[PDB]
Ligand binder design. Structure first.
Ligand SMILES: COc1ccc(C2(C(=O)N3CS(=O)(=O)C[C@@H]3C(=O)Nc3cccc4[nH]ncc34)CCCC2)cc1
Ligand SMILES: [Zn+2]
Ligand SMILES: [Zn+2]
Ligand SMILES: [Zn+2]
Length: 441
């Protein structure tokens, strides 16, 4: 073995198909059918009756297998076509698409005064966008101002852009849409972008983001607004003392960019993911922790405070303070975003109140105010006569990056973990190959 190390992949986590938001971690005992339908021990024995409705097909309980989530797949080896040396594929970062001729180890290459032919599936060679260019220029300019000897070049790429609509859910639809008081759906553009850092001639994907952008063609209350769907990171940015600043630089640059195009407001739901290691990146490092709510909120406040002092953000408020200043009276006046908290809670509010869309609206907003940031980018009379929003970047069809589920599934299916620096670099290389090959079609 190249290193002296016996290496295997970790058991990926599963789901109690009974209770939503239940998960089955490493070493837990569970019940599975056809390697598809998984139940944890508690959620399985808590089923009354040996009939288990699947799909919908009813399936007997003895047709399930009792097992524990402790399977460890060994890492794969590659063989040098010249010496026969066996090395972990991840250790030497050999990808058969990038180097189809075969794996030649570094030792045989140095003996023959040879080097690997260029990796043309790099982050740098992903197609550029005006947004990506703006973001990476900001980050790299910040990084060279810091003069830290360890920092590498950062490239930012938009890897998906497509048109979508968010549909008002049945409760709010019956209250406000069927009476003609509110649009049935809101058109928006979703964008997925990632940041990579060159670490010793090797790309590392360390940051990912998906956003929802509602243009000047959107009906109120959503028009000229951007909303962050989700954020994620792999904490191996070099150097560590600049990691937080770089995240902040990307986010501030994004607000600066959409402000320039004419978007008036930004929206952030400070919402930690559920415990586990899969959000956008599969299998986070074991010592990278999900922040607790208060610390995440302070993190966003720090970022926005820097944006205010840079004269990019005019000001920001919690949703409760914001609605008070806007003199809001009805739930139909709240921006309605895909997958956001407020569409969900408004469904429950209308149900519990027997059909009201304003009853406890202010109480619910105050109860949760610290979690919802409303960021004003264009204020005062400047926001009044704005020209239409024209995005200079084209659409980018890429099914793998339409939402976060597809890339997570591809990572799970192909053992692309981001749990260590070496595995994250390998997963980055594979992810780039996928993005380069799906595009050339
Ligand atoms: C104050 O400490 C922090 C630490 C990290 C962040 C950022 C971030 O990556 N955050 C906070 S998030 O927005 O709730 C989602 C994401 C996050 O927690 N990922 C994960 C880390 C570890 C295991 C995980 N499993 N699954 C997801 C996941 C870094 C850049 C974006 C914010 C912010 C504040
Ligand atoms: Zn090795
Ligand atoms: Zn369960
Ligand atoms: Zn060799």
């Amino acid at each position: 073995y190249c290193c002296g190390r016996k290496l295997e992949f970790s058991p990926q986590t599963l789901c109690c198909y009974g209770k939503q938001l239940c998960t089955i971690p490493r070493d837990a005992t569970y019940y599975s059918y056809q390697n598809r339908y998984h139940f944890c021990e508690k959620c399985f024995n808590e089923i009354q009756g040996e009939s288990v409705s699947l799909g919908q097909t009813t399936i007997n309980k003895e047709q399930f297998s009792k097992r524990k989530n402790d399977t460890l797949d060994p890492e794969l080896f590659v063989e040098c076509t010249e010496c026969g040396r066996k090395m972990h594929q991840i250790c030497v970062l050999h990808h058969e698409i990038i180097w189809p001729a075969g794996f030649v180890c570094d030792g045989c290459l140095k003996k023959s005064a040879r080097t690997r032919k260029e990796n043309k599936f790099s982050a740098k060679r992903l197609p550029s966008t005006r947004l990506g260019t703006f973001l990476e220029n900001r980050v790299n300019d910040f990084l060279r101002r810091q003069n830290h000897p360890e920092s590498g070049e950062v490239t930012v790429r938009v890897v998906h852009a497509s048109d979508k609509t968010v549909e008002v859910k049945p409760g709010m639809k019956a209250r406000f849409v069927d009476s003609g008081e509110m649009a049935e759906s809101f058109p928006y553009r979703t964008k997925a972008l990632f940041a990579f850092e060159e670490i010793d001639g090797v790309d590392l994907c360390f940051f990912g983001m998906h956003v929802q952008e509602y243009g000047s063609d959107c009906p109120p209350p959503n028009q000229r607004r951007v909303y962050i769907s989700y954020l994620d990171s792999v904490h191996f940015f070099r150097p560590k003392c600049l990691r937080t600043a770089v995240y902040h630089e990307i986010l501030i640059g994004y607000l600066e960019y959409v402000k320039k195009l004419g978007y008036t407001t930004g929206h952030i739901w400070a919402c930690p993911p559920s415990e586990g290691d899969d959000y956008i990146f599969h299998c986070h490092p074991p010592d990278q922790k999900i922040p607790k709510p208060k610390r995440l909120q302070e993190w966003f406040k720090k970022m926005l405070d820097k944006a205010v002092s840079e004269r990019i953000v005019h000001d920001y408020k919690d949703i409760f303070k914001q609605a008070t200043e806007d003199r809001l009276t009805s739930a139909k006046e709240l921006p309605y975003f895909e997958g956001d908290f407020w569409p969900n809670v408004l469904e429950e509010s209308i149900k519990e109140s027997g059909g009201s869309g304003s009853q406890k609206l202010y109480a619910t907003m105050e109860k949760h105010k610290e979690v919802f940031f409303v960021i004003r980018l264009i204020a005062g009379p400047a926001a009044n006569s704005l020209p239409p929003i024209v995005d200079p970047d084209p659409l980018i069809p890429c099914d793998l990056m339409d939402g976060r589920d597809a890339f997570l599934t591809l990572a799970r299916d192909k053992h692309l973990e981001f749990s260590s620096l070496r595995r994250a670099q390998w997963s980055t290389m594979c992810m780039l190959v996928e993005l380069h090959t799906q595009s050339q079609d």
